[PDB]
Structures are given as C-alpha cells and as structure tokens.
Structure 1
Amino acid sequence: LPAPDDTGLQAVLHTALSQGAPGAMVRVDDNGTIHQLSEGVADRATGRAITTTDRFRVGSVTKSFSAVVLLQLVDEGKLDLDASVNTYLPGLLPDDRITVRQVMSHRSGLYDYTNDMFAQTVPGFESVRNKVFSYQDLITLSLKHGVTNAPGAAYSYSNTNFVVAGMLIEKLTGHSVATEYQNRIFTPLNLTDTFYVHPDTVIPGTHANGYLTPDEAGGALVDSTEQTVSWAQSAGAVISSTQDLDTFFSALMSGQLMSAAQLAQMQQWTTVNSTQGYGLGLRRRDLSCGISVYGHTGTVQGYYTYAFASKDGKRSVTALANTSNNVNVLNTMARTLESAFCGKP
C-alpha cells in the first residue's frame, strides 16, 4: 500500500472542526507503525482536548461485533445462515421465508423502526435516551409497518435486522449479548477499551463527549454523551476506542475470528451503490486509488465513526468526530480513508 498521508489526515480533521465537529481524531495501524492525530475538544464546555485514547460510542459498528458472534455460532453448528429466522425465534416475523442471511445483509425487507423515532433529531433523542426497550419491543415497532420488499429481494439497511441478530444470539446461547461479546471477542483480542454496558448510560473511563447537532442550522449543540442506547442494543450500543476497533477489524480480516468459510460468507457483497457493498454485518468501500477497504461506519447521537481495514487486515484505520446530524462532517470524515489508504495524491 501507499504510505498514509498525515498532512492529508490533519487537513481532514481541521476541516471537520471548521464544519462543526468539536473534536475529530484518527488512528492508523500501518502494519505495526502507528499514525495518530486529533484536533479539538472532547468536552466543549470544559475545553478538555480530544485524544485518540478517548473512548466513544461506535454506533452501528456494533453490527460487525454481532455478525462475528453469529458467524461463530454457524461454525459451531448452532445456526444455519439459510434457515428461517422463525426456525429459531418462532412467531417472530410475519414471513417464514425471511432467513438469517437476509437479515444479516439487510435484504429482509424489515422496516427500520428508527425512522419513527428520529423524525425530529433532538426531540427523538430526548424521547429515547433514557428508555429501556426489550428486543421484542423494537421488533414490534418495526412490524407495525409492512415489510418494504420481498425477502431477499432488495438491499435496505435496517437496524431491525441487528435487533433480530441480538435476539438470536441470546436465544441460541442462553447468555446476554454482553457476555457473548466479552467471551468471543473482547477478551480474546484484549480489547481493554471496549464495552457493552446497556442499559447503563455511563461511558467507563476517559471519553469523548458527544454533541448532537440540532436540525435548525446554527442551533446550540446538545450533549448526547450519556444515554442507554437501548433503541439499538446489538445494532448500535458498543463503546470502544480507535486502537480497539483497529485491532478488531485487523483480526477479522486476517482470519482470527471465525473459519475461512464463514469469513467468505461475511464478504459476499450485496451492492449498496457503485462504490460500496454490504456483506454480513460488514461494509466494503471502494477508494479512489482502486483499493477496497472493509469494516463499518457508525452514527449514534453525537458520534460519527469510520472503522476500516485492508483485505488482509495489515492496515486499519479508525476515525471519530464527536458530533452527529452534520452531514458535512460525516462526508469530510470519510476522507480519512483516502488519506490513510491511498496516501498523497
């Protein structure tokens, strides 16, 4: 690979601050040489600077952790990707033909309940932040809507799919998702900054605060740091660090977390758009210099995350800006992948 471009990374972060991120940071693990940059503040009221060791909410990057657990259950013979979800969770879904593979690749047609919750950004955050939901509650919210397409027929990202994922983990293992994440991922990889504490609202240890941008342009930012994330759970509630997400996606892509057969299933790409695919709880992004990278993005209130690795896991990058509902910042932060993998233009 090209050399990571730290000047380019620095410009990305500075642009993200100019667009409304209080803080922005990135860590590259380049085959044993680290690159780490940060600009701005973890806490905008106190002025405490953001740093690449600050913990944060990774949002939908959680889906990759859920997918790893499920694919280990497939290795163990406890789950068949092409069986019906209702085989394992009887009566859950209105269509017996919706399969586990369809759920994990967002081809199930299940409606995303979060479109109900966040029609207004800050009011929706205020409605869910201190709520505790069961998995079934969230499924029932989805099922109030008809499915949006036939099973398997169309890619349509839906948090509901990884609420089903959590339910399947807990039913088939008899344990909580937190226990399964810990035993199958966090402990074996020594991810000392990585937690699943739902429904606790505290982020353990030193952390970046999250700042939710309101829908009204120019409006005051809302501190969204402390919330249950119960509206997402196995779709969105992991806490981590740039170092730990780098370790996780390098371990995944280098074949440490499941059989080769199941990693191949995880990497069967459904088209998202002309430069992106979706596997099983895994995104592919195709970069301008003809390199593809693998991992996931996250948006949870006040945090935008990108966490991606090369095909062989030897280079990994995690970038975080502590705002959300700011599409300029979201778009800017994607450029860290270009600078880190494609290098100087």
Structure 2
Amino acid sequence: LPAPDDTGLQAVLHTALSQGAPGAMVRVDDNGTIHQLSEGVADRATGRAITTTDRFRVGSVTKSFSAVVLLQLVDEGKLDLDASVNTYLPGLLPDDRITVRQVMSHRSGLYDYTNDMFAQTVPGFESVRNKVFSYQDLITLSLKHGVTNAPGAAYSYSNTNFVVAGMLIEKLTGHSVATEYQNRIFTPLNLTDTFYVHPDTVIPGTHANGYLTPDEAGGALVDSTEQTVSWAQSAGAVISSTQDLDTFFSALMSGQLMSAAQLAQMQQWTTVNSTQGYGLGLRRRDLSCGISVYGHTGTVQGYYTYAFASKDGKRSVTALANTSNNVNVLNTMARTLESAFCGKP
C-alpha cells in the first residue's frame, strides 16, 4: 500500500470542522505503525479537546458485530443463511420466503422504520432517545408498511434487517446480544473500550459528546450524547474507540473471527452503487486509486463513523466526527479513507 498521508488527513479534519463538526479524528494502524490525528472539541460547551482515545457511539458499525455473531452460529451449525427467517422466528415476517442471507445483505424488502422515526431529525431524536423498545416493537413498526421489493431482489438498506439479526441471535443462543458480543468478540479481541450497555444512556469512561445538527440551516446544535439507542440495538448501539474498531476489522479481514467459508459468504457483494458493495453486515468501498477497503459506517445521532480495513487486515482506519445530520461533514470524513489508503497524490 501507499504510505498514509498525514497532511491530507489533517486537511480532512480541518475541513470537517469548517463544515460544522465540533471535533474530528482518525486513527490508522498501518501494519504496526500508528497514525493518529484529532482536531476540535469533544465537548463544545466545556471546550474539552477531542482525542483518538475518546469513546464514542459507532452506530451502524454494530451491524458488523451482529453479522460476526450470526456467522459464528452458521459455523456451529445453529443457523443456515438460506433458511427463511420465519423458520427460526415463526410468524415474524409477512413473507416466509425472506431468508437470513437476504436480511443480512439488505435484500429482504423490509421497510426501514427509521424513515418514520426521523422524518424530522431533532424531533425524532427527542421522541426515541429515552424510549426502550423490544425487538418485536421495532419489527411491528416496519411491518405497518409493505415490503418495498420482492425477497432477494433489490438492495435497500434497512435497520429492520439488523433488528431481525438481534432477534435471531437471542432466540438461537438463549442469551442477550450483549453476552454474545462480549463472549464472541469483545473478550477474545481484548476490546477494552468496547461496550454494549443498552438501554443505559451513559457512555462509560472518557468520551466524545455527540452533537446533532438540526434540519434547519444555521440552527443550534443539540447534545445527543446520552440516549438508549433502543431504536437500533443490534443495528446500532455498540460503543467503541478508534483503536478497538481497527483491531476488530483487522481481525475480521485477517480471518480470526470465523471460518474461511463464512468470511467468503460475508464478502459476497451486492451492488450498492458504482463504487460500493454490501456483503453480510459488511461494506466495500472502492477508492480512487483502485484499492477497495472493507468495514462499515455509522451515523447514530451526533456521531459519524468510518471504520475500514484492507483486504488482508494489515491496514485499518477509523475516523469519527462528533456530529451527524450534516452531509458536508459526512462526505468530507469519507476522504480519510483516500488519504489513509491511497496516500499523497
């Protein structure tokens, strides 16, 4: 790989701040050599500086954790990716043709309930932030709407799919998702900054606060740090750090978290757009220099995450900006992958 470009990383972070991120940071593990940069504030009211050791909400990066647990259950003979969801969770979905593999790759047609929840960003946050939902409650919210496409037929990202994932985990193991994440992932990889505390609202330890951008241009930021994340659960509620996400995706890509056969299933790409794919709870991004990287994004209120590794896991990158609902910032932060993997132009 090209050398990571720290000057380019610096510029990306600075641009993100100029676009409304209170703070922005990035860590690169380059085959044992660390790159770490941060700019701005973890807490915009106190002025406390952001740092790459600050814990944060990884949002939909959680889907990759959920997928790892499911794929280990496949390895153990407890789950068949091509069995129908309703084989395991009778009567859950309106169509007994929707399979586990389709849910995990967003090909199920299940309506994304979050489009109802967050039609208005800040009011929707205020509505859900202190609520506790069951898995079933979230599925019922989706099922108020028709499916959007035939099973398997179309890619359509939906939180509902990874709510199903958490249900499946809990039903088949008899354990909570927190227990499964801890025993299968957090403990074996020694992820000392990684937690699943749902429905607790506290972020353990030193953390970046999250700042939700309102839908109204120029509006005041809303502190969205403390919330249950019950609206997402196994689709979105993991807490981590840049070091731990780097460790996790390196371990994944280098073959440490499941059999080779299941990793290959995880990397069967469904087209997302001309430069992206989706596997089983896993994203592929194609970079300008002809490198692809593998991992996931997150956008939970107040936190934009990128966490991606090279194919062999030897270079991993995690970037965080502590705002959300700010596509300028989202788009800018994607450029950390360019600078970290493609290097200087």
TM over 0.5: yes
User: Alpha-carbon deviation of 1:237?
Assistant: 0.1
Secondary structure of the equivalent of 2:96? coil
User: Alpha-carbon deviation of 1:157?
Assistant: 0.2
1:52-72 CA-to-partner distances (Å, cap 9, x unmatched) read 000000000000000000000
User: Alpha-carbon deviation of 1:119?
Assistant: 0.4
Q: Distance in 1 between matches of 2:213 and 2:142?
A: 26
User: Alpha-carbon deviation of 1:183?
Assistant: 0.1
User: Alpha-carbon deviation of 1:320?
Assistant: 0.0
User: Alpha-carbon deviation of 1:293?
Assistant: 0.0
Unaligned runs of 5+ in 1: none
Secondary structure of the equivalent of 1:184? helix
1:37-92 CA-to-partner distances (Å, cap 9, x unmatched) read 00000000000000000000000000000000000000000000000000000000
Give the corresponding residue for 2:128: 128
Q: Distance in 2 between matches of 1:21 and 1:115?
A: 24
Q: Distance in 2 between matches of 1:302 and 1:264?
A: 33
User: Alpha-carbon deviation of 1:158?
Assistant: 0.2
Secondary structure of the equivalent of 2:34? strand
User: Alpha-carbon deviation of 1:2?
Assistant: 0.0
Give the corresponding residue for 2:31: 31
Q: What percent identity do the matched residue pairs reach?
A: 100
Q: Distance in 2 between matches of 1:148 and 1:292?
A: 30
User: Alpha-carbon deviation of 1:193?
Assistant: 0.1
Give the corresponding residue for 2:8: 8
User: Alpha-carbon deviation of 1:112?
Assistant: 0.3
Secondary structure of the equivalent of 2:43? coil
User: Alpha-carbon deviation of 1:115?
Assistant: 0.4
Unaligned runs of 5+ in 2: none
User: Alpha-carbon deviation of 1:212?
Assistant: 0.2
Give the corresponding residue for 1:320: 320
Provide the TM-score with structure 1 as the length reference: 1.00
1:110-140 CA-to-partner distances (Å, cap 9, x unmatched) read 0000000000000000000000000000000
Provide the TM-score with structure 2 as the length reference: 1.00
User: Alpha-carbon deviation of 1:27?
Assistant: 0.0
Q: Distance in 2 between matches of 1:193 and 1:237?
A: 14
Total equivalences in the alignment: 345
Secondary structure of the equivalent of 1:25? strand
Give the corresponding residue for 2:248: 248
Secondary structure of the equivalent of 2:91? coil
User: Alpha-carbon deviation of 1:102?
Assistant: 0.2
Q: Distance in 2 between matches of 1:112 and 1:325?
A: 18
User: Alpha-carbon deviation of 1:160?
Assistant: 0.1
User: Alpha-carbon deviation of 1:231?
Assistant: 0.2
Q: Distance in 1 between matches of 2:279 and 2:245?
A: 18
1:237-259 CA-to-partner distances (Å, cap 9, x unmatched) read 00000000000000000000000
Secondary structure of the equivalent of 1:284? strand
Secondary structure of the equivalent of 2:299? strand
Say yes or no: does 1:111 pair with 2:111.
yes
4+ runs of 1 displaced by more than 4 Å? Answer: none
1:199-239 CA-to-partner distances (Å, cap 9, x unmatched) read 00000000000000000000000000000000000000000
Q: Distance in 1 between matches of 2:6 and 2:327?
A: 23
Q: Distance in 2 between matches of 1:156 and 1:216?
A: 27
Secondary structure of the equivalent of 1:43? coil
1:179-209 CA-to-partner distances (Å, cap 9, x unmatched) read 0000000000000000000000000000000
Q: Distance in 2 between matches of 1:185 and 1:57?
A: 17
Q: Distance in 1 between matches of 2:117 and 2:129?
A: 11
Q: Distance in 2 between matches of 1:98 and 1:218?
A: 43
